[PDB]
Design a protein around this ligand. Structure first.
Ligand code: ICS
Ligand code: ICS
Ligand code: MG
Ligand code: MG
Ligand code: MG
Ligand code: MG
Ligand code: MG
Lengths: 522, 477, 522, 477
C-alpha cells in the first residue's frame, strides 16, 4: 500500500510488515539459503586474522580494486585541451562506461566518442573505423582537435594508430594540418593514471617533437604546470590562484576545470576553456615544467627532460604544510618572484587551525587509499597533524613508491605503527580494519561497504568513512573541494577534526548513559 | 508538430552527416504511423553503430554481466580480463536484493581476474583456475560461479570452457563460462542472448531428473525483472495477493536454485521481452511451459496485465484478481487526483534501452502526459512493432540515436520533460529541461505496480514542477 | 584502571563495570532519585501535544533562549574598526563572558576591557571608573580608539556616558582629540543584534554628526556596506570579493575579519585590519549605504537617511539566488558598473547544483532558528530549493518581521504548511519537533540537546542538527564558511543535501535489513 | 632565572602603567621565597580589579550560579534578570552528571526570567512568582529551585526572599534566593561565600530533626569537587575501595538529598578550599563534623592524601589504604615510565582561579616538569600561604594578573607550556607556546586520582610534543 500524503520509496516501503512477510517466504521456500547461523559463522570468520592470512595469500583473484583502466585517464587528459574531443579507438562498451563513471562523480556531461570496433575488426584491424570515425566526429561535434586513445581490443590486435591516422589524412577523411594526437592506452598495463601520463605525453609530443630547432628555454618567461589525473575542481583553481597571487606567469597544461563546471544557464556547451594549441606549442619556451603528481607522470617527465630540456624539479605533490612550502619556494627560486604576504598569512591561518584542533586529532588512527601521489600527500599531512596512518594502501603503485613512503613514515614517530600495501585491493583493506581497527577510513565511495561490514560485527567495531578521493558517487558536490596547498590542507583538517567530533557526539548522545560527555563546547 | 514538420526536422538534422553516415542514419529515424504493422517499413534496428557519432550504447559484457547474470545474488560473477569493465559496472545498476554481502550474496562486489600484460601474452587460463580456488577458500558460501569474458578473452584464444568443466566437477558447483566479449554483437542486446544461452547450457538442466519439488496449479515465474529499486517486489506482491506462487524472479533478487526450479512452474511471466524471450521460448519448447508478456507501469497496464494473467488460470484466480483491483482502486485514484492536475498536458521525450521506451507510456498517459518522441539504444524490429500502437501519430522515433541528433530533436520539439540515461541527464538540465533518469529511476522507485505508481507520479511532479527551472536566466540579461 | 596503551578519558572510562556499579550505588543510596518508570512516563509526556499546549501558555518562564544581550553585539561591532578596543562600562563579570563566548565560536583571542564597577558605584556612579579605565586602557594596550558600551548595572543606575567621557577628557585622563565613541547597550532591551546597531550608530554619529557641512553625496565615488552582526568570516570575504570582481569601489563599515583570523606565525596581534577612522569620516561622501542585514539595523538606517542623506535601498539580506540577484543588480544600478560574466557564471553553477540535487531536497521539512535576517534568508533559500520550512523561530524578532515572513511564505507553495514563532525559545522548539516532526533542524550548537531528546524517544523520532548560525562550539572552523551570495548558497546546498544523504546511508547501512537501499551512487 | 632577574622583570613590566595603577599592581606581583610563612609580606590579594586593565576575572553570579549551585542536578537554577548571564554560562563549565536532562536533571539548561524594560521599571517579583508556577507545571520532577540574582535584582529593590518563602510553602519544595549580583564583591570569590551561605540558611538544616538515615563509622562527603570531566567520580572510586562510604559530593553530580544528608557524615574531605571552606566550618561548629584538606592531582599527592584520610579512621581502613596504593602502584608507574622522558625538564606557567594554581604542581613534578610561574584570579592570602612551599625559590607569582602582565612575563620567561583559561589559550598558541586548559581540561580529563593522572600525562605530552609547534616560522623568511 501507499498513502498519498506519505508516499514511501524502496526504503522504507519494503520495511512494511507485508513486504517483510513476503520476502521471508520467498527465502524459505525457493532460495535454499544457508542457515543464518551459518551466515553469521562465516561472517565472524571473515573478520579474523586467520582469514586475513589466507586473504593476503591471494595470487590470482582480485576483489573490490581501488583503480581503473588507462583510457579513463586518457579521456580526462584530453578533456583538458581547448575544444578537444577525446576519441577512444576500439569498442564502444568502454566509452559508455568512461562517460557514466565521470558523469556520476562530477554530476556533469562527459563528451567522448568511440569508433565502435566489432567482430569484423579482429580479423582485419580497425583501419576503416579510424577513417570514418575521425571524419564523422569532425563533421558532427566540430572539435578543433581529436585526442586518440585505445581500448584493450585494439591493443591486442595491434592497430597501428600512427599509420591509421596518416592514411585517414591521405584519403581526405580529415585535413592535413588537423591535430590528431594519439596514444596507446592498454588497460592491462598500470591504471587510469598511466593512461593520463601516456595521453599527455602523446599530446606534448604531437605538438613539439619536430619544432624544437627554434625554441629557447626561458624565452617566454613562464613555468608550465602539469596536473596529472585530478578530479577536484578546487585543485585546478587553487594552483591558478597561488600563481596569480605571486604574479607568476603560468601555463596549465590540461585544464578541464571549465568543461567540468559549465553553468546551467539555458545552453549546453560541449566545450569550455582548456589549454590552447598555442600554449602547448609554446610550452618548450617556458623556464621549466612542474609535475604536480610526479609518481604518475613517469613518461611525461622523461619526454620533458629529453626533448624540451626542462630539468623538472623533484617536488612532491603540494599537499599539507611542508610540501606546499617547498612548492612555493621552488616556484620562487625559478621565477625570481617573491612569495607574497597574502600567502604567508594563509599559511599562518592553517597553522592556527592546526594548533586549535590538535587535541582532537592526536593519536587518531587512519586507513587510507587512492592514487599514489594523493595517498603520499595525505599521509604526509596526517603525520603533520599527529595522526597515525596505520593502513596505507595503493592498488596502482610500484615498489619504488612503497620505499619512498616507508622513508616518509620512518621520519616521523607517528609513522612507527604503519604499513604500506601496494597492489592490494579493498577486500584486503577490509580485513586490515577488522584485525587492527582504526578510528576512520579515508577513501572513495567504495569504502561505504567496508563501513557496512564493520557495523554488522558491532557498533563498537564500525569504522566511519571520510570520503576524500575518486570516485565519490553518494555525496553531491564534493568534487568542488580542494586538497592541494594551504586551502586544501584547511579543508582536509576541517573534515577530519569535524569527523572526530561528529562520531564522538554520536557515541555520547545516549541519555543517562554516555551523555555525561555530550559537551556543548569542544 | 505535424508529420510534415517532423520529417523536415529529420531531414535538417541529417544534413550535418558525411555521406556514408547520412545514408545509414536516415534508416534509423521515423515518424510514427499507426496504420503500419510492419515496423521494418519505417525503421531499421539492431545494426552496428557508426564510428565517431557518440552512440549511447554499451557492449555485450554489459548485456550479460551488467544485466542478466550480475543480479543473481548467491553466485559470484568474475569479470575475466583487465580491471576496467568490472570497476565501471560495480554497483552502477540498482538491481535490489536481500543478502549478507561478502558472505552469501555478492551482487555489489567486483570480482575480476585483473589481467596484466603477461596474462595477455601467455593467456589467463591458469590465472583463472587458481582464481576459482581462491574464491572457494575465501568465499565458501557461494553457490556457483560465472565467468564473464571481457574483450581480450576471445582475441588471445583462452579456453574458459575447459576451466569451467574441470573446476565445476572438482568443486561440485556450477561454473558457467560466458563469452560476452565486448566486440561481439553491436550492443548490450547480444549479451542478453549469449547469457540466456549460458543459462540454458550450464544451469537450467540441473534438476531435469529431480522430481522432488512440490508443485501447485498456481506456480509462476517472473522472467526479466531485474528489481530496479525494488520493482520486482512491488510486482511480486500483487501476484501473490492474486493467488499465485512466484517460484522465481529472473534475475532481480534471484538465486541459482530459483533458476533451476523454473522448469517446474506452470507459466512464465515475461516483463522484459528483449533480454529474456530467448530462454522463455527454450522453456516452452523443452518443458512445454507457456509464457506471456505483461506490463506493470501504471494502473491501466497493471489492471489489464493482472486480468490477462489471471485468465490463464481458473475462476478462483479471476475472482481473487478482481479483489486486488478493488483494493488498490482508491490508492491509485488518489495518486491521480493529486498529481494529474500538476502534469496534465505536459510532453515527454524518452530514450532508454530495449523495453522502457514503450513500456512506460501508459503510466505517463494516466497522468495526462503525452510522449511526443521515444526510441531505443538496442531494440530489434519486434520491439518497434510493439511500439507502433503505444505511441501517438506523427510522433518521432529514433533508433541508436546519436548525441547530436538527440540534442537537435530536443531543441526543436521543446519537451517539458525528458526520460533517459546518466550520459544524457546533465546535458538537458543545462538547457533548462526537467530530466528523470529512466534507468536508475534517479535513485528512487520502485515504479512497478500500484505502489510504484505513487512514487513515479511523485517523481515526475517533483522534477517537472521544480522551482529550480524558473531560474536559469540571470535577470539582468 | 588504565592500561597505558589504551588510556580512556571520561568516555569511555566510566563505562567500565566498576564505575557503572559505583554510580548505581551512588544513585540508590543517596540521590533519592525518582523511579526510572516515573522518569520515563514524564519524558513521554513532554513529547505530547498536551504538554506543547501548556508549554506555549508560558508568559514568564524562558527556557533555553536563542539570543544573547546587547553589549555582546557592541563588542563585535567595535572589533571591526582599526586598532580599536571594546570597552564595556559596567560590571567586569559581563566581559569575561563576552570574551569566552566569542573565544569558543571563533577559536581566537577576543580583546575587550571593563571598568569594573562594584558595590560602590551603585550609589555614587561609575564616573571614577570611566576616568581611570579610559586612561589605563589607553596606556596599557595603546588602541587608537576606545568604543564604549554598557552593562545592565550602569544602565539601571543611569550613568551618563557622554558627560563621564567629557570629564575624563577635561581632567587630562585621555587626550581631548582621542576618539571615544559610545553607546547605551541595555541588556534588557532587544538583544545582541540591537547592541550591534546601537554601537554602530554611536560610532557613525561620533565621526560625522557635526561634520556634515563639507559633505556631498557621491563625492567620493564609493558605496558603503554595513554588515551587522556577522560571525561567518566567509561572509565578510564574499562581499568584498564580489565588489572587487564588479570593479566597485566600496567601504566596509565594521570589518572584523582580519582580527578574528590572525595567523599563528610566532607573534600575537591584538589589533589587525578593520575600518579606518578616515573611512568612517569620509563615509557621508559615498553614493549610498547598503545594509546587509536590514531587520537588525533600524537605528543605523534612520541615522544614515537623516544625517548622511543616503536613501538606503530596501534590500533583503543577499542570501540565496533571488536576493543575491537583487543585491548585485542594485549595486550595478547605484554604481553604473555592469555585473560581469564571472558572476553570471558563478550564478549558473549554483543553478546547476540545484538541478543536480533537487531530488534529494524536494519536500524536506526543516525546523530552524537564529537571528531574524539570517532566518529570513535561510527560509527564502529553502523555498528556492523546494524544501518545506515547517518550524520557523526567531527569539529576537518582532511582529513586523513575522508579518513580512508570512508574506514570503505565502508567495511559495512550499511555505503553505509553515508557521513563524517570534519571542520563543528552544524549549518551545523542542515541543514542535516532537509534535510535528521535521527531517532536520537548522540551528546553532544549542540544537544538539534537542537532537539528544528526540533520539531518546527513539531512533525513528530522532531529528539531526545541521549547524548553521551562532554560536557553534562543538565543531571547529565552520566560522570560516559563507552563507551570503552565490558562494554561500552553494555551501549551504551542499551541507543540506549531504545531510540528507548521510542520514539515508545511516538508515540503510543495516546488513540484510535496510541495506537493499544502500546504493553506491546517489 | 635569579631572584633579582625576576624582580627586575616585574619592574620592567610595571613601567607601562599610569602612576595610580602602577602603585596597585606592584603589590600583586611577587618572587617566591620559601622561608616566608606569612604570604602578605610579598603579595596582596582579594582586592578590587583596576578599571580598563583587562582582568581575566568574572563575578559573584559566576561563583554562585556557574560554580557552586549550577552543578546540583535535580534542582532548577533560575538566572534571574536579563538574558545574557545565563546564556553565556549555559554549559560552558564541564560539571559532569548522570541524569535525564529536562526531566529529572537540569544542569545544562538555561532557565531565566529574561528581563525586559518593564521588569526593570516595575520590578520582577510578580514575574518571578509566575515563572515558579510554570516551572512546577512543565518540570514536575524538580526537587527544588534556586534563584540566582543578576546585577539588576538588587539595584531595583526586588524582594526575591519574600517570593521564595511564599513559593516554598506553597509547593512543598525548597526555594532558595541567592543574592549573587555581580556588582557584589570583586570577583567569583564572594559568589562562593554568598552561595555557601544560601546552602546553610535554606537547605542544610532540613533534616536536623530527621534521623531516619542509617549512618556507619565510615561515612564521608567530598566537598568542593565539581566533577570536571568526572573528577569526583575518579576520586569517589578510590575512597570506596579504601572502604569509606561516600554519602555526598558537593556539588558535581550532587543532589539536594545528599546536601541534606551531609550533616550525618563522620568526615568532610575538602578538595576546593576556596569555594567551600565556609560551609565546612559551619558544619564543624554546628554538627561537630571534622574536616580536612586533600589533593588528588598526581600520585605523590594522591598517595599522601589517602593515607592522611585513612588515619582519621581505624586500622581496617588504614590496611585497605595500603591495598589501594599497592593496586594502582604499577599503573601510575607505567604512566611515569612512558611520559616523564618526553617531559623531563619542561617549564610551565599556570594561571587559574582559587585552587588549581597550587594544587596541580605535584602532578607536573611527578613528570619531571617545573612550574616556574603560577597565579590565581580571585584567591585570598590563605591560598597564597599554602602556595609558598609548593613553588620553588625565585619563581614568579601573580594575582589578578592583567592581560598585559601575563603576555610580557611569558615572552621574557619563555615557558615550554602554559596552563590557563579559554581567554588566554588562543593568545599563546599564536606565539608558539603549547597551551593546556586548566579549567575545562581542554575537553579532556578527568585529571583527579590515579585514573586522572594517565589522561593528564597523555595530554601534557600530546600538546607539548605536538608537530604543530615546529612550523610557525615560514621557511622562506
Ligand atoms: S533488461 Fe535491459 S538499458 Fe530490459 S539492457 Fe538495460 S533493467 Fe534499460 S530499457 Mo538500462 S531492456 Fe532492463 C534495461 Fe530495459 S539496464 Fe535496464 S534500464 S528493462
Ligand atoms: S571551584 Fe573555583 S576558576 Fe575551586 S571558581 Fe573556578 S572547578 Fe578554577 S581553580 Mo574555573 S576555586 Fe573550581 C575553579 Fe578552582 S570554575 Fe573551576 S577551574 S577548583
Ligand atoms: Mg525489508
Ligand atoms: Mg552538474
Ligand atoms: Mg582542544
Ligand atoms: Mg584560532
Ligand atoms: Mg589548547
Amino acid at each position: 500500500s501507499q498513502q498519498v500524503d506519505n508516499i514511501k520509496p524502496s526504503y522504507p516501503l519494503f520495511r512494511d510488515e507485508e513486504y517483510k512477510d513476503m520476502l521471508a517466504k520467498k527465502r524459505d521456500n525457493f532460495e535454499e539459503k544457508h542457515p543464518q547461523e551459518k551466515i553469521d559463522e562465516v561472517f565472524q570468520w571473515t573478520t579474523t586474522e586467520e582469514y586475513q592470512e589466507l586473504n593476503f595469500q591471494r595470487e590470482a583473484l582480485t576483489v573490490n580494486p581501488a583503480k581503473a583502466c588507462q583510457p579513463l585517464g586518457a579521456v580526462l587528459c584530453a578533456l583538458g585541451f581547448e575544444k578537444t574531443m577525446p576519441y577512444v579507438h576500439g569498442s564502444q562498451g568502454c566509452v559508455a562506461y568512461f562517460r557514466s563513471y565521470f558523469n556520476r562523480h562530477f554530476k556533469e556531461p562527459i563528451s567522448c566518442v568511440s569508433d565502435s570496433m566489432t567482430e569484423d575488426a579482429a580479423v582485419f584491424g580497425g583501419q576503416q573505423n579510424m577513417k570514418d570515425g575521425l571524419e564523422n566526429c569532425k563533421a558532427i561535434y566540430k572539435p578543433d582537435m581529436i585526442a586518440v586513445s585505445t581500448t584493450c581490443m585494439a591493443e591486442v590486435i595491434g592497430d597501428d594508430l600512427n599509420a591509421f591516422i596518416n592514411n585517414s589524412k591521405k584519403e581526405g577523411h580529415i585535413p592535413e594540418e588537423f591535430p590528431v594526437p594519439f596514444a596507446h592506452t592498454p588497460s592491462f598495463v598500470g591504471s587510469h593514471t598511466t593512461g593520463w601520463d601516456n595521453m599527455f605525453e602523446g599530446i606534448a609530443r604531437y605538438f613539439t617533437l619536430n619544432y624544437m630547432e627554434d625554441k629557447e628555454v626561458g624565452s617566454n618567461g613562464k613555468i608550465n604546470i602539469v596536473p596529472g589525473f585530478e578530479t577536484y575542481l578546487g585543485n585546478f583553481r587553487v594552483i591558478k590562484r597561488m600563481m596569480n597571487e605571486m604574479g607568476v606567469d603560468y601555463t596549465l597544461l590540461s585544464d578541464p576545470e571549465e568543461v567540468l563546471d559549465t553553468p546551467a544557464d539555458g545552453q549546453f556547451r560541449m566545450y569550455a576553456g582548456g589549454t590552447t594549441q598555442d600554449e602547448i606549442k609554446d610550452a618548450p619556451n617556458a623556464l621549466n615544467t612542474l609535475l604536480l603528481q610526479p609518481w604518475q607522470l613517469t613518461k611525461t617527465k622523461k619526454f620533458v627532460k629529453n626533448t624540451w630540456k626542462h630539468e623538472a624539479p623533484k617536488l612532491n605533490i603540494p599537499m599539507g604544510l611542508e610540501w606546499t612550502d617547498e612548492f612555493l619556494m621552488k616556484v620562487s627560486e625559478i621565477t625570481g618572484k617573491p612569495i607574497p604576504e597574502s600567502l604567508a598569512k594563509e599559511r599562518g591561518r592553517l597553522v592556527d587551525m592546526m594548533t586549535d584542533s590538535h587535541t582532537w586529532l592526536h593519536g587518531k588512527k587512519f586507513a587510507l587509499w587512492g592514487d599514489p601521489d594523493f595517498v603520499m600527500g595525505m599521509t604526509k599531512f596526517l603525520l603533520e597533524l599527529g595522526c597515525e596512518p596505520t593502513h596505507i594502501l595503493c592498488n596502482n603503485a610500484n615498489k619504488r613508491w612503497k620505499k619512498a613512503m616507508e622513508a616518509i613514515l620512518a621520519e616521523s614517530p607517528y609513522g612507527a605503527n604503519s604499513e604500506v600495501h601496494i597492489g592490494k585491493d579493498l577486500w584486503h583493506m577490509r580485513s586490515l580494519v577488522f584485525t587492527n581497527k582504526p578510528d576512520f577510513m579515508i577513501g572513495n565511495s567504495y569504502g561505504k561497504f567496508i563501513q557496512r561490514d564493520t557495523l554488522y560485527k558491532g557498533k563498537e567495531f564500525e569504522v566511519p568513512l571520510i570520503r576524500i578521493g575518486f570516485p565519490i558517487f553518494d555525496r553531491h558536490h564534493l568534487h568542488r573541494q580542494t586538497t592541494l596547498g594551504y586551502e586544501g590542507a584547511m579543508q582536509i583538517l576541517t573534515t577530519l577534526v569535524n569527523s572526530v567530533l561528529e562520531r564522538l557526539d554520536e557515541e555520547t548522545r545516549g541519555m543517562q548513559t554516555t551523555d555525561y560527555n555530550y559537551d556543548l563546547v569542544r | 508538430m505535424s508529420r510534415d514538420e517532423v520529417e523536415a526536422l529529420i531531414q535538417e538534422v541529417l544534413e550535418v552527416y558525411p555521406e556514408k553516415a547520412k545514408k545509414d542514419r536516415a534508416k534509423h529515424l521515423a515518424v510514427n504511423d499507426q496504420s503500419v504493422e510492419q515496423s521494418k517499413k519505417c525503421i531499421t534496428s539492431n545494426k552496428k553503430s557508426l564510428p565517431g557519432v557518440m552512440t549511447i550504447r554499451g557492449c555485450a559484457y554489459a548485456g550479460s554481466k551488467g544485466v542478466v547474470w550480475g543480479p543473481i545474488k548467491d553466485m559470484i560473477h568474475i569479470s575475466h580480463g583487465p580491471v576496467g569493465c568490472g570497476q565501471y559496472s560495480r554497483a552502477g545498476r540498482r538491481n535490489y536484493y536481500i543478502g549478507t554481502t561478502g558472505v552469501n550474496a555478492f551482487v555489489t562486489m567486483n570480482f575480476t581476474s585483473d589481467f596484466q600484460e603477461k596474462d595477455i601474452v601467455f593467456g589467463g587460463d591458469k590465472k583463472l583456475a587458481k582464481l576459482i580456488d581462491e574464491i572457494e577458500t575465501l568465499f565458501p558460501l557461494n553457490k556457483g560461479i560465472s565467468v564473464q569474458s571481457e574483450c581480450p578473452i576471445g582475441l588471445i584464444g583462452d579456453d574458459i570452457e575447459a576451466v569451467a568443466k574441470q573446476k565445476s566437477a572438482e568443486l561440485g558447483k556450477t561454473v558457467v563460462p560466458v563469452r560476452c566479449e565486448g566486440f561481439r554483437g553491436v550492443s548490450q542486446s547480444l549479451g542478453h542472448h549469449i547469457a540466456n544461452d549460458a543459462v540454458r547450457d550450464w544451469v537450467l538442466s540441473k534438476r531435469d531428473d529431480d522430481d522432488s519439488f512440490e508443485s501447485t496449479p498456481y506456480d509462476v515465474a517472473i522472467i526479466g525483472d531485474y528489481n530496479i529499486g525494488g520493482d520486482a517486489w512491488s510486482s511480486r506482491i500483487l501476484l501473490e495477493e492474486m493467488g499465485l506462487r512466484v517460484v522465481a524472479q529472473w534475475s532481480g533478487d534471484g538465486t541459482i536454485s530459483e533458476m533451476e526450479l523454473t522448469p517446474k512452474v506452470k507459466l512464465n511471466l515475461v516483463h522484459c521481452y528483449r533480454s529474456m524471450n530467448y530462454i522463455s521460448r527454450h522453456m516452452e519448447e523443452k518443458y512445454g511451459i507457456p509464457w506471456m508478456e505483461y506490463n506493470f507501469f501504471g494502473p491501466t497496464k497493471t489492471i489489464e496485465s493482472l486480468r490477462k494473467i489471471a485468465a490463464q488460470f481458473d475462476e478462483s484466480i479471476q475472482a481473487k484478481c478482481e479483489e486486488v483491483i478493488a483494493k488498490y482502486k482508491p490508492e491509485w485514484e488518489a495518486v491521480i487526483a493529486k498529481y494529474r492536475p500538476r502534469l496534465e498536458g505536459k510532453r515527454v521525450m524518452l530514450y532508454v534501452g530495449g523495453l522502457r521506451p514503450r513500456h512506460v507510456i501508459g503510466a505517463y498517459e494516466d497522468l495526462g502526459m503525452e510522449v511526443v518522441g521515444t526510441g531505443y539504444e538496442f531494440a530489434h524490429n519486434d520491439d518497434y512493432d510493439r511500439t507502433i500502437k503505444e505511441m501517438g501519430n506523427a510522433t518521432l522515433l529514433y533508433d541508436d540515436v546519436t548525441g547530436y541528433e538527440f540534442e537537435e530533436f530536443v531543441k526543436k520539439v521543446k519537451p517539458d520533460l525528458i526520460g533517459s540515461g546518466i550520459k544524457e541527464k546533465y546535458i538537458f538540465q543545462k538547457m533548462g529541461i526537467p530530466f528523470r533518469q529512466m534507468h536508475s529511476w534517479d535513485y528512487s522507485g520502485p515504479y512497478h505496480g500500484f505502489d510504484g505508481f505513487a512514487i513515479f507520479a511523485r517523481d515526475m511532479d517533483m522534477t517537472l514542477n521544480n522551482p529550480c527551472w524558473k531560474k536559469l536566466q540571470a535577470p539582468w540579461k
